[PDB]
Design an enzyme around this catalytic site. Structure first.
Site, PDB file in Angstrom:
ATOM      1  N   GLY A  90      33.486  41.453  23.829  1.00  0.00           N
ATOM      2  CA  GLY A  90      34.773  41.957  24.240  1.00  0.00           C
ATOM      3  C   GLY A  90      34.720  43.125  25.271  1.00  0.00           C
ATOM      4  CB  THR A  91      37.381  44.208  27.733  1.00  0.00           C
ATOM      5  OG1 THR A  91      38.483  44.253  26.828  1.00  0.00           O
ATOM      6  CG2 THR A  91      37.460  42.835  28.469  1.00  0.00           C
ATOM      7  CB  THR A  92      34.418  48.987  28.083  1.00  0.00           C
ATOM      8  OG1 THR A  92      33.666  48.113  28.892  1.00  0.00           O
ATOM      9  CG2 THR A  92      33.524  50.133  27.478  1.00  0.00           C
ATOM     10  CD  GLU A 118      35.861  47.029  31.857  1.00  0.00           C
ATOM     11  OE1 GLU A 118      35.468  46.225  30.972  1.00  0.00           O
ATOM     12  OE2 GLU A 118      35.134  47.621  32.720  1.00  0.00           O
ATOM     13  CB  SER A 175      36.401  46.059  21.889  1.00  0.00           C
ATOM     14  OG  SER A 175      35.439  45.222  22.546  1.00  0.00           O
TER      15      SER A 175
END
Lengths: 248, 252, 245, 232, 241, 245, 204, 244
Positions: C31-33, C48, C76
């Site tokens: 998953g995205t930061t 993000e 996330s």
């Protein structure tokens, strides 16, 4: 194989694999034994400290289910405790409103049996890890002793034993048992039999031995009633066991 | 496979539980239904082995569902027990709600409904029992004969064999049976039913159970003496026919 | 592997871990930061949300979601799965408000969320969670920052980080302990949050991102959480671009 | 391994489930729809399918409300359970709060409902994508609902078979249709161009077109026959 | 294999599970009930024994379910306990409801439905037990039945189950006198019990026995589980002791 | 493997194989044909005979669902029993609530809504019926707001309207023949002799009425199931027509 | 008052010395209408005798009720139910319903076999331990009988002495009550022998 | 062996035991933490290590000593998930017990009801055993100072002193020498502070590793209360040892 990955199906020679394993689980336990006499019943067990620092004095492995009936086990330690809990509750319900005082020995055994049976019945349940001995005293059938199997069957006995040293204890009891024994005499058999099992540690600190004989108004906690019957169950202390253990 | 539960069919469209149920039928005792025009005779094989074994207290192979509709069965006897009581309680309950006599077409349809419901579910299995249910109602003098199947199918047949070695009886039954005139004689309907069951019993008339249903709520169970009377007459005709066939051969 | 041990969540390995819980942690990584930075007077959350195509609408898909009006949470891993832990979280929040007529303390919330993850490992018929959740706010005791694992382990943090570009974030957070032993003040931490996510976006480079920042600060958002948007966010963006260059 | 090809309660070594992945497959075998929107309108254009020429074609547009509506691409059984649910929520908002349910808010309820079946070991998980339009207080919005439960707000998107050419129409002309507002005619024409390219080894026909439109001036209406042979 | 749930069928159109319950009987003790017009005897054999086993002040394979009907057990004993208790409860419902004692045919019939119910429904075992029912009702007099582990019943005048059923059956039907007597039942039972059992000297502490009689102390039925010394008397007549 | 065992497991098509297999159950079943015209819908069926004892005219395969609704069927009668009892209740309940005829389309929705149950529970649908339905129905009736409509209720998906549709073993060859022989110029009588013309071709038995049964939906007539004499007559007209051409 | 008062009927049990008597009237009435001149109110489960007073339904229904429980007790334990233990039971069983309590006033009497001591015990609607070694009387003429029995009782009596005392007691007290009488029957449990002596008395 | 056996807690092995429960007794080595509980004469002491290994973790959020209720402390050894689950149930039941029964829930009785709880999780296959070891410390009003340790099996037994961790043995042996030679099962001094000095010294020798204020957390149970010490209070006791 599949006759103890499932509980539905049986071996073609009879019985589930689960039951034969439940007996293996019994023998992996301490040794417990009972001897019936005609004026008493002795019940005796050993307690593994299993650490020099463990206190087995603080939890004893001889536990009153009701004041006139104590029990021991051989088999898994966790499995014993909940099973004992249910013994105390059902006893009041089943006969302390029917007779208004604690049950017959005989009755509580038929109750216990149904619980063990129900865990042999269906998948997604396991047998209990123990076989118990229930000894007690009532006036309707007198002194009694029983062995209660986690298969869901129970058998009355005169003397029997179970645990790790069972097979050695059983032949021993056959020889020394007589038609009339005293309570004192049965305590003197009970120490020798259990000592075959463990030696190099035998003392009454590590061996717990106790009796079901006559009333104790001293463990009753009251007196002044002409009909009172105090606990048939009685615990000997560490010091009293030593007096009997010398007597050998 | 596709035999692991009732929630899986095979790619032919079959469910193997049902197919092994059809083999189950063949295990237990035979049953024959044969219609007349004022009767239906519903006859079944009675299993006896040993002398000890009674035919007083021992469970009958004909059960009275009501006083005008009867059911005999084929399959597992243990399985068929639950099926027998259910069908009778439903029988009374029709009459509690409506106040009417027990309709045959309703009766098979509900009974095969019990079986269907289990088949529909996966958590429970149906019975491996197929029944014959024959009867009349007080409003009909036109006879009805029904069948159930362990799937949840109900069918109507003129005449039928199910159960132990059905197959050979099945072809015998076809020839004799006419849909022109089904046996108008009541005695001849019973006699045909005796000839059919004769094949599967080997020797017997204490192992032949005949029961007869006629209109307006008349039901009978026929005593052992009467079942034995058929056999003497039926052996005399079979043998006679056989001797004659060999005479046609002699003539040429 | 085999012999159980990951095949169910009840069953345990001889090592002291569970290899089914290890693949859930791998899903948080994918998953995205997201980062969270604790402050001596607030908390800042950033995320993000990558842009994959310009067919998306800007400032409309995010992983920042609010709980009450003063507890921010951001997730996330598996996107709808992080949403759900917030949706139940929101239900838990409401119960507490009705019964005690008080806003929820952040460590109280912290106990209650991790009991949901743990219930989903006691049953072989319930798939665990596979999301980490950065969270915190301002309460009675001031500002607190927490993070929760999909194991069902949680602890308090001064700076927290999760997702794919978490390798950069962790490093910038450390520079911060040394730089400020207050963990930075809440005003200057909105700009600190943007710069962090830009170095993290160097590990996602082949694509563009959209940066959403939110905050909750004692007396510079007035005890309440509100979204950093407007001329505020653009200043945060300008600081980040400048110092990265 | 692929011991995880059976378990939906047990993580696969990648961190996914295979079941969720197969569910994306179902969408691919599923029937094409193109979404797009503007501030004052939103349009769904969908392909009707047939198995033969004595078929009178499958409804791919279900009216959820008189201002909201959806289209499908993938499993029609799964599409039914979620359509039921979805109408129940929009009517609830009109009953208690005299309120239109926002496009975005509806979508978050559907999210919990996908992941419930993922968490459970009971009943099918979903395998249909829904393209959702509505027009609320915040103008027309277009969500792409996935059987995972991920809900994505775009200016145009497409799901179903051979849907990668619809994204290419939409990307190029992204801005053309932001500038058009108040012309329902224009927005309808743009989906039609879109789904010609999407398709391969097919052509559009009159009765393959079902165009569903809602905006700020246009009521929720479905155009068929002579009302869609004006934009072919 | 078919072993997973009882909701399946083997290719005989039965279930393998039923076969496994069958076999459970043939590793337990032997059981014989012989009916006569003058009383029915029930007999069972003990499958454990010791000299420190209490079995002289007790029985375990013999229960009275009401004061007119008694049962014998062959199978595992663990299985037995649950279903005995239910039959006895069903009897006292009958007594409460109808103001009279249950018929033999129903009581058995119920019990048979219940065994089949655990086959029919769920993944729960069949209960591998065979019970010999010896009863009285004033509709068909004395009635001897037995109940299958599959869960069906069949009427009788003599039956054997348990271990070596076939061996036992041939021997019982040979020596069956057609009027029969309760005294001859008692006599036949010991003889038949001996040859199946793996001891050459059958003994009373190895015996359980109940005889049911209305033919002495008429107009009422009195059922008596024998005491150990009485069992010894009947053994001395058959010449075993 | 672990794909045909389970109702909660999809395969690489994103489908259940529970759902697939149930189609092949219908193809097992006897041939049934329905052909819509604007005069009434004509529902024909096949029955089989393998015994002279089988009474096939004393059990049904065309059934009345209301007083202008009829259905033909193919597949297992077990799966059909549940389906038709259900469908009887839907029409009956409609007359209660509104005091009006049931519409054709809405009866189709209800039958496919039962069909959906394949397992045990689900959110938004309680499931109590634990297998696929190995039966379909052709559903024909009349509403006034359209006309005569003919539908195929699919147990495996949603419902597809047809103008003429064949199901069962002989479905395949029938479908080709209906394209080249269904037309909007064809009267009530022609509709009957068309069904019997296709019916025999895929029958492995002679064309006779003990293996056949026609019916029509004429609103004027109510739903009428035919006599045997009428069908017998028509086998004869069919053969005389084709003898001469 | 209560329903027990409408239907009435008396059961009186008494103690002498290694004996009991428990006796009853044969009147069942349902209000003003007299119903049976011959319904015995004495029943028994082994040696324990249960009388029942009160409403007519609960006389028949509770009898079935306590029969059920004494039969499971008898079979399992292989001994007779004891009057000492049955007193426990009656009180809990009636107490099970409290929100639909049975409207009766039972009397339990029997002689224990595990000591030979005579036991009588009294109960009310939902029952309580009421211990006596003298007498327990019950019913609509209970207030008459409480005094009548005390007055004639002389402590420590023969089995033959106890007959006389309970007979004269019943004879006048039942007669001079509206809702009681209409025949009587006396059971003298000598130890384990029970002789049954029907009282010739008038029809009330 | 393995054929069902280890994959379940409702499938017994050929030994009659459960491999799966026994594998959690190997889950105390993964967190790498050690405890020491000792009893004084009027007190009970518990000292467990505190691991702060990162400067992005506050020392005050990482603790393993939990207040369960007023007079009851507990040390947790082993995994953080099963740590929480045990903690909740112990707080809910302790609070519930205390007013239902009007008694302060003794060390024996809390250790008892939890051990019962742990047995119930093992009999059904739906639930699973706890992984953590909980060592309960209280000064009881019916027995004075007590230590009952409840095991991830549902065994519980009393202890003079007990230790847990991967290096558990090395501490055990040190406590063996101490109580055995003196012929008392307590640390002789009566002040709780001076007992804590002795207990800290035994651990630093035994593990071989000197500890710091942010490498311990200490709870001290006194007569009808419990309180957990903060780092500067712990430092005072450490330096007590260091300089005589």
């Amino acid at each position: 194989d599949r006759y103890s990955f499932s509980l539905t199906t049986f071996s073609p020679s009879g019985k589930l694999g689960q039951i034969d394993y439940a007996l293996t689980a019994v023998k992996q336990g301490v040794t417990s034994l009972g001897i019936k006499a005609t004026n008493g019943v002795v019940i005796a067990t050993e307690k593994k400290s299993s650490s020099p620092l463990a206190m087995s004095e603080t939890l004893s492995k001889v536990s009153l289910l009701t004041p006139d009936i104590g029990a021991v086990y051989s088999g898994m330690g966790p499995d014993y405790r909940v099973l004992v809990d249910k013994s105390r509750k059902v006893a009041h319900t089943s006969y302390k409103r029917i007779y208004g005082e604690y049950p017959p020995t005989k009755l509580l055994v038929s109750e216990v049996a149904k619980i063990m049976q129900e865990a042999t019945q269906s998948g997604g349940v396991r047998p209990f890890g123990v076989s118990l001995l229930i000894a007690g005293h009532d006036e309707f059938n007198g002194f009694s002793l029983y062995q209660v199997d986690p298969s869901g069957s129970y058998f009355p006995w005169k003397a029997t034993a179970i645990g790790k040293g069972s097979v050695a204890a059983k032949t021993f009891l056959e020889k020394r048992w007589n038609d009339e024994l005293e309570l004192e005499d049965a305590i003197h058999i009970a120490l020798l039999t259990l000592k075959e099992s463990v030696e190099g540690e035998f003392n009454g600190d590590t061996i717990e031995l106790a009796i079901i004989g006559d009333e104790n108004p001293d463990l009753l906690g009251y007196t002044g009633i002409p009909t009172d019957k105090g606990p048939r169950f009685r615990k000997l202390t560490s010091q009293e066991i030593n007096d009997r253990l010398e007597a050998l | 496979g596709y035999d692991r539960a009732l929630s899986i069919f095979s790619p032919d469209g079959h469910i193997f539980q049902v197919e092994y149920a059809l083999e189950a039928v063949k295990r237990g005792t035979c049953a024959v239904g044969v219609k007349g025009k004022n009767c239906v005779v519903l006859g079944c094989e009675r299993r006896s082995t040993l002398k000890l074994q009674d035919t007083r207290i021992t469970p009958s192979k004909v059960s009275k569902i009501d006083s005008h509709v009867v059911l005999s069965f084929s399959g597992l006897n243990a399985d068929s027990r639950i099926l027998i009581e259910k069908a009778r309680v439903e029988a009374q309950s029709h009459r509690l709600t409506l106040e009417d006599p027990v309709t045959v077409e309703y009766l098979t349809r509900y009974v095969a409904g019990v079986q269907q419901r289990y088949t529909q579910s996966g958590g429970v299995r149906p019975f491996g029992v197929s029944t014959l249910i024959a009867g009349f109602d007080p409003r009909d003098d036109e006879p009805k004969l029904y069948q159930t199947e362990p799937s949840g199918i109900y069918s109507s047949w003129s005449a039928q064999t199910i159960g132990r070695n059905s197959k050979t009886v099945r072809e015998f039954l076809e020839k004799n049976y006419d849909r022109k005139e089904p046996p108008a004689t009541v005695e001849e309907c019973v006699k045909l039913t005796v000839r059919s069951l004769l094949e599967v019993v080997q020797t017997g008339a204490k192992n032949i159970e005949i029961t007869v249903v006629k209109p307006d709520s008349d039901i009978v169970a026929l005593s052992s003496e009467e079942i034995n009377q058929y056999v003497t007459q039926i052996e005399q005709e079979k043998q006679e026919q056989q001797e004659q066939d060999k005479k046609k051969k002699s003539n040429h | 592997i085999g012999t159980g041990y990951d095949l169910s969540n009840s069953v345990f390995s001889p090592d002291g871990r569970n290899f089914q819980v290890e693949y859930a942690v791998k899903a948080v990584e994918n998953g995205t930061t997201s980062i969270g930075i604790k402050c001596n007077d607030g908390v800042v959350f950033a995320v993000e949300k990558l842009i994959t195509s310009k067919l998306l609408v800007p400032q409309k898909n995010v992983k920042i979601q609010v709980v009450d009006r003063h507890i921010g949470c951001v997730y996330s891993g598996l996107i709808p799965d992080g949403r759900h832990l917030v949706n139940r979280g929101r239900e838990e929040a409401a119960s507490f408000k009705k019964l005690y007529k008080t806003p929820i303390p952040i460590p109280a919330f912290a106990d209650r969320l991790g009991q949901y993850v743990q219930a989903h490992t006691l049953y072989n018929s319930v798939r665990p969670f596979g999301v980490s959740t950065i969270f915190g706010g301002v309460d009675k005791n001031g500002a607190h920052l927490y993070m929760l694992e999909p194991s069902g382990s949680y602890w308090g943090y001064k700076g927290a980080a999760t997702g794919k570009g978490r390798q950069s974030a962790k490093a910038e957070l450390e520079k911060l302990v040394d730089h400020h032993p207050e963990g930075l003040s809440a005003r200057e931490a909105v700009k600190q949050a943007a710069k962090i996510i830009y170095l993290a976006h160097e590990d996602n480079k082949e694509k563009d991102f959209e940066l959403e920042i939110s905050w909750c600060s004692l007396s510079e958002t007035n005890g309440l959480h509100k979204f950093v948007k407007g001329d505020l966010l653009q200043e945060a963006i300008d600081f980040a671009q400048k110092e990265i260059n | 391994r692929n011991n995880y090809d059976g378990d939906t309660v047990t993580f696969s070594p990648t961190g996914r489930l295979f079941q969720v992945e197969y569910a994306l497959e179902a969408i691919k075998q599923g029937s094409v729809t193109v979404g797009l929107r503007s501030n004052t309108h939103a349009v769904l254009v969908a392909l009707k399918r047939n198995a033969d020429e004595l078929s009178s074609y499958q409804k791919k547009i279900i009216k959820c409300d008189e201002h909201m509506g959806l289209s499908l691409a993938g499993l029609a059984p799964d599409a039914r359970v979620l359509s039921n649910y979805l109408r129940q929520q929009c009517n609830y908002s009109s009953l208690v709060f005299n309120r239109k349910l926002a496009v975005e808010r509806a979508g978050h309820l559907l999210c919990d409902k996908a992941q419930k079946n993922t968490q459970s070991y009971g009943g099918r998980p979903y395998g249909v994508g829904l393209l959702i339009i509505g027009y609320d207080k915040s103008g027309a919005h277009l969500l792409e609902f996935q059987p995972s439960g991920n809900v994505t707000e775009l200016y145009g998107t497409a799901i179903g078979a051979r849907s990668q050419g619809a994204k290419t129409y939409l990307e190029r002309t992204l801005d053309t249709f932001i500038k058009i507002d108040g012309n329902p005619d224009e927005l309808i024409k743009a989906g039609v161009e879109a789904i010609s390219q999407s398709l391969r080894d097919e052509s559009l026909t009159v009765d393959n077109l079902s165009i569903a439109i809602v905006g700020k001036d246009t009521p929720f209406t479905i155009y068929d026959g002579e009302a869609v042979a004006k934009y072919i | 294999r078919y072993d997973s749930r009882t909701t399946i069928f083997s290719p005989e159109g039965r279930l393998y599970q039923v076969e496994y319950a069958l076999e459970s009987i043939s590793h337990a003790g032997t059981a014989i009930g012989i009916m006569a017009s003058d009383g029915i005897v029930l007999a069972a054999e003990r499958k454990v024994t010791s000299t420190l086993l209490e079995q002289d002040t007790s029985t375990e394979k013999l229960y009275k379910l009401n004061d007119k009907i008694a049962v014998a057990v062959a199978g595992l004993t663990a299985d037995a306990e649950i279903l005995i208790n239910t039959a006895r409860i069903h009897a006292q419902n009958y007594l409460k409801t109808y103001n009279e004692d249950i018929p033999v045919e129903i009581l058995v019939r119920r019990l048979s439905d219940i065994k089949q119910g655990y086959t029919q429904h769920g993944g729960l075992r069949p209960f591998g037990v065979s019970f010999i029912y010896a009863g009285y009702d004033d509709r068909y007099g004395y009635q001897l039945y037995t109940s299958n582990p599959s869960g069906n019943y069949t009427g009788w005048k003599a039956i054997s189950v348990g271990a070596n059923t076939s061996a036992a059956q041939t021997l019982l039907q040979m020596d069956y006198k057609d009027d029969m007597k309760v005294d001859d039942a008692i006599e036949l039972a010991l003889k038949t019990l001996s040859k199946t059992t793996d001891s050459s000297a059958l003994t009373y502490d190895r015996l359980e026995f109940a005889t049911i009689r209305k033919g002495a102390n008429d107009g009422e039925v009195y059922q008596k589980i024998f005491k150990p010394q009485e069992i010894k008397d009947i053994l001395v007549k058959t010449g075993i002791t | 493997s672990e794909y045909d065992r389970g109702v909660s497991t999809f395969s690489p098509e994103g489908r259940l194989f529970q759902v697939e297999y149930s189609l092949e159950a219908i193809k097992l079943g006897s041939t049934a044909i329905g052909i819509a015209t604007k005069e009434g819908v004509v529902l024909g069926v096949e029955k089989r005979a393998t015994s002279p004892l089988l009474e096939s005219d004393s059990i049904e395969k065309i059934v009345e669902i209301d007083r202008h609704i009829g259905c033909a069927m193919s597949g297992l009668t077990a799966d059909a029993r549940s389906m038709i009892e259900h469908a009887r209740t839907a029409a009956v309940t409609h007359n209660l609530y509104y005091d009006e005829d049931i519409n054709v389309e809405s009866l189709t929705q209800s039958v496919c809504d039962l069909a959906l149950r394949f397992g045990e529970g689900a959110s938004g649908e309680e499931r109590l019926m634990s297998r696929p339905f190995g039966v379909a129905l052709l559903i024909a009736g009349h509403d006034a707001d359209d006309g005569y409509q003919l539908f195929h209720a699919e147990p495996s998906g949603t419902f597809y309207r047809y103008n003429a549709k064949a199901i069962g073993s002989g479905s395949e060859g029938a479908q080709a023949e209906l394209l080249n022989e269904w037309h909007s110029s064809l009267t009530l009588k022609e509709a009957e002799l068309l069904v019997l013309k296709i019916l025999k071709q895929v029958m492995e038995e002679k064309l006779d009425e003990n293996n056949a049964q026609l019916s029509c939906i004429t609103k004027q007539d109510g739903f009428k199931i035919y006599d045997n004499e009428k069908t017998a007559e028509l086998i004869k007209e069919l053969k005389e027509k084709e003898a001469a051409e | 008052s209560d329903p027990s008062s409408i239907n009435g009927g008396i059961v009186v049990a008494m103690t002498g010395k290694d004996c009991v008597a428990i006796a009853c009237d044969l009147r069942l009435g349902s209000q003003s209408l007299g119903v049976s001149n011959k319904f015995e109110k004495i029943f028994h489960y082994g040696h324990v005798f249960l009388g029942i007073t009160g409403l007519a339904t609960d006389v028949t229904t509770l009898n079935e009720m306590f029969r059920y429980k004494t039969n499971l007790y008898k079979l399992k334990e292989e001994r007779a139910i004891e009057p000492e233990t049955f007193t426990q039971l009656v009180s809990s069983s009636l107490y099970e319903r409290r929100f639909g309590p049975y409207f009766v006033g039972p009397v339990v009497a029997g002689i224990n076999s595990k000591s030979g001591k005579p036991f009588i015990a009294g109960f009310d609607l939902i029952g309580c331990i009421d211990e006596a070694k003298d007498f327990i009387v019950s019913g609509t003429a209970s207030d008459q009988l409480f005094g009548m029995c005390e007055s004639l009782y002389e402590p420590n009596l023969e089995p033959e002495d106890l007959f006389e005392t309970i007979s004269q007691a019943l004879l006048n007290a039942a007669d001079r009550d509206a809702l009681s009488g209409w025949g009587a029957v006396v059971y003298i449990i000598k130890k384990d022998e029970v002789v049954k002596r029907y009282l010739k008395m008038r029809q009330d | 062996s393995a054929a069902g056996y280890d994959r379940h807690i409702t499938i017994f092995s050929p030994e009659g035991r459960l491999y799966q429960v026994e594998y959690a007794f190997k889950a105390t080595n993964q967190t790498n933490i050690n405890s020491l509980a000792v009893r004084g004469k009027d007190c009970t002491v518990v000292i467990s290590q505190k691991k702060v290994p990162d400067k992005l973790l506050d020392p005050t959020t990482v603790s393993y000593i939990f207040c369960i209720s007023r007079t009851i402390g507990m040390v947790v050894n082993g995994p953080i998930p099963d740590a929480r689950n045990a903690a909740l149930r112990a707080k809910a039941e302790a609070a519930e017990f205390r007013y239902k029964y009007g008694y302060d829930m003794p060390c024996d009785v809390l250790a008892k009801r939890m051990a019962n709880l742990s047995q119930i999780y093992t009999q059904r296959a739906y639930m699973r055993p706890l992984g953590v070891i909980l060592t309960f410390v209280s000064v009881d009003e019916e027995l004075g100072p007590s230590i009952y340790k409840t095991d991830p099996a549902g065994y519980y037994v009393g202890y003079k002193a007990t230790a847990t961790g991967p290096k558990q043995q090395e501490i055990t042996t040190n406590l063996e020498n101490h109580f055995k030679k003196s012929k008392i099962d307590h640390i002789n001094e009566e002040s709780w502070e001076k007992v804590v000095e002795f207990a800290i010294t035994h651990m630093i020798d035994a593990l071989g590793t000197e500890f710091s204020k942010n490498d311990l957390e200490v709870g001290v149970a006194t007569k009808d209360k419990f309180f957990t010490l903060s780092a500067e209070n712990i430092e005072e006791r450490l330096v007590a040892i260091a300089e005589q």
